[PDB]
A and B are shown apart, each in its own frame.
Chain A
Amino acid sequence: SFQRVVHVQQKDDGCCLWHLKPPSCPLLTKFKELNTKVIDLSKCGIALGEFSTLNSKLKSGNSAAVFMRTRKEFTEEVRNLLLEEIRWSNPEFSLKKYFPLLLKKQITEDMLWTEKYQPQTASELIGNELAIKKLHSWLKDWKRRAELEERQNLKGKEEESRLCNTVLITGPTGVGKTAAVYACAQELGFKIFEVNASSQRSGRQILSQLKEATQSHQVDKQGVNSQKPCFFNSKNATSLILFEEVDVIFDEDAGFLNAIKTFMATTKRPVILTTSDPTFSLMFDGCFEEIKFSTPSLLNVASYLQMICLTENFRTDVKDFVTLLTANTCDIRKSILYLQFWIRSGGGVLEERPLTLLPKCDSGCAETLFGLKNIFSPSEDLFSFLKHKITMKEEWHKFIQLLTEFQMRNVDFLYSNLEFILPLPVDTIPTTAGKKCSALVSHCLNSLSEFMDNMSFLDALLTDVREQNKYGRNDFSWTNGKVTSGLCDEFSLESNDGWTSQSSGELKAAAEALSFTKCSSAISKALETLNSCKKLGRDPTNDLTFYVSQKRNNVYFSQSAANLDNAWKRISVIKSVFSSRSLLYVGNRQASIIEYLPTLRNICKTEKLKEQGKSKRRFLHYFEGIHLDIPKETVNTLAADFP
């Protein structure tokens, strides 16, 4: 067809703007002529190392240093000296209990350290002592019930007990839930029937092939009983049903929660559910005993890993393992497996360290874990390279690659370790000359204030590699943060960009590198003058020291500048307080915390100080006097003080 698409604009006569002419002013009539003459690039050749580190000289013999390390088996004396070093490092650890067990376990391999040093006994588990005692007592009660039923069977031919048939184990990943279940079942003679998400677990199939496990005896009550058949469909031994990652549910896993509801409903044998998410406790309906595994103490698992490496003829400092565990967020299986890799590779760095509290120490698994040995020379140390001045182009590209590696994890390496890296003294918390003191303090202050201006610019006006607050809000929030990973096989089909990630990581690396180089150089230049100030008799170094925490000082380097134990305890306190039934319908959460929470802390401390005065006991009857069902542990926690 091709009709005419006429421009219909309502041109009325007048308005002094419809028909316009170019202005007659001289500035806008002076249009400079445009020139496209570029410099010719065929004449100019690119030199060697012009845009990179192509140096004519090349290093030979520094790299390719093969280890070929033969670990001589430690004698009794040096091993006992290392045991006493571990004991002096960790005085609260019962060392003499766990080392003969490791020696028995160790006594051409084809099998991992996780199953080599797999705990056979529940007492051999590390951390979560209350939880393992509760689980062991529950299984002792259940095996006693099974034994009593057997005695009743041979003799023939429950509100007081509250022996609930099912227990939910919850905790973080790799803390040893499956290991503790295996250990206690092996010790008490239980036969575990394992149900995993890796196998087919549909309701009809699991019911038709697992109901008679709890509705009957066992055909082989003697002999080969402590083996664990993974259930799938492609002394007398009591049955024990185990359900690993009940939280992982697929569309193929149809009617699984109803199925397990029927199992717990009709069972006569103990059933154990284990998972990692905290949310499974609320969405699942039923009667079940709950067991929580907290994150184990860092020093205990550090001593345990150090005994493990001692058994394999390696001596290693505690602080390196503390850094490794905090990097893994105290994950036992991660640290054990990476230790197995790093040990069987021959160790990282051979450096002698004479400590009494002998073979050479093997510190340096922390920087090997982060891949920093792929960047630096084996002679180079991390903090040693950090402290000196960076001028060489190759050294500065290695520092760029270092920051690029830490910014892929969205971790500010330079700022989380700013006190340990700045050219100023750092210590653990327990007149014209004065004008020069204040002036040097002012130059250092201007340098650091400029640095915080820069890193504020890198937070806001540089993008991040991974988009923060993608599924929750910013950190330190009591709303949610229980963002469980996906459960479906359908792909994301998203339209994200990847160029603005690989480029952005280098962008923030370069910006952070140049800003820290500038501020460190400025602080060093200001501190060069401090010799004259010391000669003048005044020492402003008390104004220049940095007061850091003891927990942060125990590590070689920190990935965070904050306390997460405090964050976890506050967040648990607030979540438990606003879980109260009276305050369960409050809508405005920021108003909720910021208004009710300080006032409720005032009421808690007022009640505490009233009880401190030997006054009437009815002062204890305020919260229950207005039906505030707030538990006494939380009341005591909020009545301590405001930190």
Chain B
Amino acid sequence: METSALKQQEQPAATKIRNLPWVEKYRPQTLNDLISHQDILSTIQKFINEDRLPHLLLYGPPGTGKTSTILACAKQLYKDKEFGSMVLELNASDDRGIDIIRGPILSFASTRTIFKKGFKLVILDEADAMTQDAQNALRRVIEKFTENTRFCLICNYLSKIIPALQSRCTRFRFGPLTPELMVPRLEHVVEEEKVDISEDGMKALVTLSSGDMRRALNILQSTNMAFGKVTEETVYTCTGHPLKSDIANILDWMLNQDFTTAYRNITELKTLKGLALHDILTEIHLFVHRVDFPSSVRIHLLTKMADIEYRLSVGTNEKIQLSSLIAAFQVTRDLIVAE
């Protein structure tokens, strides 16, 4: 029940004199305004304008723009005098069991409209959190009400959705947004907001964001407020992400020094900078395919850090796992350096 109170209060909510949520500044409005995934949006426009909209499954990593897209589609299909009469919005906030599917959903999909005649629509945000029996009733309520009401399923993990439910709808994946298309957006935000930023700043902003403009705006917002300047160092310090120079020195210590010296240096740096061994493993793996090695070095090293990433999951001692991480390089690469 409710929780639409907080969203409706939140939409025109800002201090507007001191708060500056620039993530909330730049919102696309319609499919012609969402400048990404243009094939998907044009396909939606084609299916809408032919009265041939199939059941939809919009899935992808969060923040890629599924909810605003389907909100634009809903406002396009139906005017503001009949939007609540034809579109039902739900999510996992109102989880009481499977009674949602046989309650509001089954009652809503079983009736005609109220004022004007036309096909209806239900959007189910975060439908991955629906239980297996809830989804298993949801497939039936789709099957026996397919001609009256179309269904939109907003999801984040494709695999968990039961096969028949993905079978009765077509699917659209909101993939990561390509960096070549995301650099002009951040350049526009920077020039509009008079921000000093270098090329490593753009590179770190797009690399950390992993094709999400919301998360990029969050990072640049935080760095601009915390420092007033944005670069690789300022972003990574504000993020608390591994600095590339630091992990480069970590790699240098395993590839040049001996066991004990590199061991205590990396231990002191982890204490000094607050790093957990998972992220060192990720960033050194990012360095492995870039630094030139023979193939045998690459397979042996990759297998060993894979097994270390396994062993770190169960929750063993991180100290001995760091030691084995140094040992992986000490076995092969430093022996060849001696050679």
A5 near B292 with CB under 8 A, answer no
A6 near B226 with CB under 8 A, answer yes
A21 near B245 with CB under 8 A, answer yes
Closest chain A residue, CB of each to CB of B221 = A2
What are the 6 A-B residue pairs with the smallest beta carbon separation, nearest first? A23-B252, A499-B159, A4-B225, A2-B19, A20-B249, A22-B248
Find residues 383-408 in chain A having any chain B CB closer than 8 Å to their own CB: none
Question: Given the complex, which residues of A lie within 8 Å of B291, measured CB to CB?
Answer: 27-28, 30-32
Docked pose: A23 CA to B252 CA in angstroms: 6
Docked pose: A95 CA to B132 CA in angstroms: 52
A-B contact pairs, 30 of them (CB 8 A): A2-B18, A2-B20, A2-B21, A3-B225, A5-B222, A7-B226, A9-B273, A9-B274, A17-B268, A17-B272, A18-B272, A20-B249, A21-B245, A22-B249, A23-B248, A23-B251, A23-B252, A23-B256, A25-B252, A27-B255, A28-B291, A30-B291, A31-B290, A31-B291, A34-B290, A491-B98, A491-B131, A493-B131, A498-B132, A499-B160
Docked pose: A24 CA to B295 CA in angstroms: 24
A25 near B256 with CB under 8 A, answer yes
Closest chain A residue, CB of each to CB of B243 = A20
Docked pose: A32 CA to B249 CA in angstroms: 18
A17 near B269 with CB under 8 A, answer yes
Closest chain A residue, CB of each to CB of B265 = A17
Find residues 191-245 in chain B having any chain A CB closer than 8 Å to their own CB: 221-222, 225-226, 237-238, 240, 243-245
Docked pose: A21 CA to B225 CA in angstroms: 26
Least CB distance from A42 to B in Å reads 16
Contact of B133 among A25, A491, A497 (CB under 8 A): A491
For chain A, the bracket of interface size reads: 20 to 34
- Return the CB mask of A488-499 against B: 1 if under 8 Å, else 0: 000111111111
Question: Given the complex, which residues of A lie within 8 Å of B20, measured CB to CB?
Answer: 2
Is B296 an interface position by the 8 A CB rule?
A: no
Question: Given the complex, which residues of A lie within 8 Å of B248, measured CB to CB?
Answer: 22-23, 28
Is A227 an interface position by the 8 A CB rule?
A: no
- Return the CB mask of B135-166 against A: 1 if under 8 Å, else 0: 00000000000000000000000011010000
Least CB distance from A140 to B in Å reads 50
Is B246 an interface position by the 8 A CB rule?
A: yes
Least CB distance from B33 to A in Å reads 26
Least CB distance from B211 to A in Å reads 14
Question: Given the complex, which residues of B lie within 8 Å of A28, measured CB to CB?
Answer: 248, 251-252, 255, 291
Question: Given the complex, which residues of B lie within 8 Å of A32, measured CB to CB?
Answer: 290-292
Find residues 246-266 in chain B having any chain A CB closer than 8 Å to their own CB: 246, 248-249, 251-252, 255-256, 265
A1 near B15 with CB under 8 A, answer yes
Interface size of B by CB at 8 A reads 39
Docked pose: A492 CA to B132 CA in angstroms: 10
Is B97 an interface position by the 8 A CB rule?
A: yes
Is A15 an interface position by the 8 A CB rule?
A: yes
A7 near B98 with CB under 8 A, answer no
Contact of B240 among A2, A6, A7, A23 (CB under 8 A): A7
Docked pose: A17 CA to B275 CA in angstroms: 14
Closest chain A residue, CB of each to CB of B222 = A5
Least CB distance from A26 to B in Å reads 10
B272 near A15 with CB under 8 A, answer yes
A494 near B290 with CB under 8 A, answer no
Question: Given the complex, which residues of A lie within 8 Å of B225, measured CB to CB?
Answer: 2-5
Task: Please list the residues of chain A having a beta carbon within 8 angstroms of any beta carbon in chain B.
Answer: 1-7, 9, 15, 17-18, 20-23, 25, 27-28, 30-32, 34, 491-499
A4 near B97 with CB under 8 A, answer no
Interface of B is mostly: helix
Docked pose: A25 CA to B256 CA in angstroms: 8
- Return the CB mask of B288-324 against A: 1 if under 8 Å, else 0: 0011100000000000000000000000000000000
Question: Given the complex, which residues of A lie within 8 Å of B226, measured CB to CB?
Answer: 4-7
Least CB distance from B336 to A in Å reads 10
Docked pose: A22 CA to B269 CA in angstroms: 15
Closest chain B residue, CB of each to CB of A18 = B272
Least CB distance from B139 to A in Å reads 14
Least CB distance from B149 to A in Å reads 25
Docked pose: A27 CA to B131 CA in angstroms: 52
Docked pose: A18 CA to B243 CA in angstroms: 11
Question: Given the complex, which residues of A lie within 8 Å of B162, measured CB to CB?
Answer: 498
Docked pose: A519 CA to B36 CA in angstroms: 54
B255 near A25 with CB under 8 A, answer yes
Question: Given the complex, which residues of B lie within 8 Å of A496, measured CB to CB?
Answer: 132
Docked pose: A499 CA to B161 CA in angstroms: 9
Question: Given the complex, which residues of B lie within 8 Å of A6, measured CB to CB?
Answer: 226
B131 near A494 with CB under 8 A, answer yes
Question: Given the complex, which residues of B lie within 8 Å of A2, measured CB to CB?
Answer: 18-21, 221, 225
Docked pose: A234 CA to B27 CA in angstroms: 59
Question: Given the complex, which residues of A lie within 8 Å of B274, measured CB to CB?
Answer: 9
Least CB distance from B140 to A in Å reads 16
Least CB distance from A494 to B in Å reads 7
Docked pose: A493 CA to B96 CA in angstroms: 10
Question: Given the complex, which residues of A lie within 8 Å of B246, measured CB to CB?
Answer: 20
Find residues 1-60 in chain B having any chain A CB closer than 8 Å to their own CB: 15, 18-21
Docked pose: A494 CA to B19 CA in angstroms: 41
Question: Given the complex, which residues of B lie within 8 Å of A15, measured CB to CB?
Answer: 268, 272
Docked pose: A28 CA to B288 CA in angstroms: 10
Closest chain A residue, CB of each to CB of B248 = A22
Docked pose: A107 CA to B249 CA in angstroms: 93
Least CB distance from A481 to B in Å reads 27
Least CB distance from A18 to B in Å reads 7
Least CB distance from A20 to B in Å reads 5
Docked pose: A1 CA to B21 CA in angstroms: 10
Question: Given the complex, which residues of A lie within 8 Å of B244, measured CB to CB?
Answer: 22
B292 near A30 with CB under 8 A, answer yes
Docked pose: A590 CA to B222 CA in angstroms: 59
Question: Given the complex, which residues of B lie within 8 Å of A5, measured CB to CB?
Answer: 222, 225-226, 238
Docked pose: A493 CA to B133 CA in angstroms: 9
Question: Given the complex, which residues of A lie within 8 Å of B97, measured CB to CB?
Answer: 491, 493
A25-B256, A31-B290 known; A1 vs B245 contact (CB < 8 Å): no
Closest chain A residue, CB of each to CB of B225 = A4
Least CB distance from A154 to B in Å reads 62
Docked pose: A162 CA to B159 CA in angstroms: 64
Question: Given the complex, which residues of B lie within 8 Å of A497, measured CB to CB?
Answer: 159-160
Question: Given the complex, which residues of B lie within 8 Å of A4, measured CB to CB?
Answer: 225-226
A1 near B19 with CB under 8 A, answer yes
Question: Given the complex, which residues of B lie within 8 Å of A23, measured CB to CB?
Answer: 248-249, 251-252, 256
Least CB distance from B162 to A in Å reads 7
Question: Given the complex, which residues of A lie within 8 Å of B256, measured CB to CB?
Answer: 23, 25
B21 near A498 with CB under 8 A, answer no
Closest chain A residue, CB of each to CB of B129 = A495
Least CB distance from A4 to B in Å reads 5
Question: Given the complex, which residues of A lie within 8 Å of B133, measured CB to CB?
Answer: 491-492
Docked pose: A493 CA to B132 CA in angstroms: 9
Closest chain B residue, CB of each to CB of A6 = B226
Closest chain B residue, CB of each to CB of A10 = B272
A1 near B159 with CB under 8 A, answer no
Question: Given the complex, which residues of A lie within 8 Å of B222, measured CB to CB?
Answer: 5
Known: A22-B245, A23-B248. 18 other contacts (CB 8 A): A2-B20, A4-B225, A7-B237, A15-B268, A15-B272, A21-B249, A23-B252, A25-B252, A27-B255, A27-B291, A32-B291, A32-B292, A34-B290, A491-B97, A492-B131, A494-B131, A497-B160, A499-B159
Docked pose: A4 CA to B246 CA in angstroms: 25
Question: Given the complex, which residues of A lie within 8 Å of B221, measured CB to CB?
Answer: 2
Docked pose: A496 CA to B23 CA in angstroms: 35
Docked pose: A584 CA to B14 CA in angstroms: 70
Closest chain A residue, CB of each to CB of B18 = A1
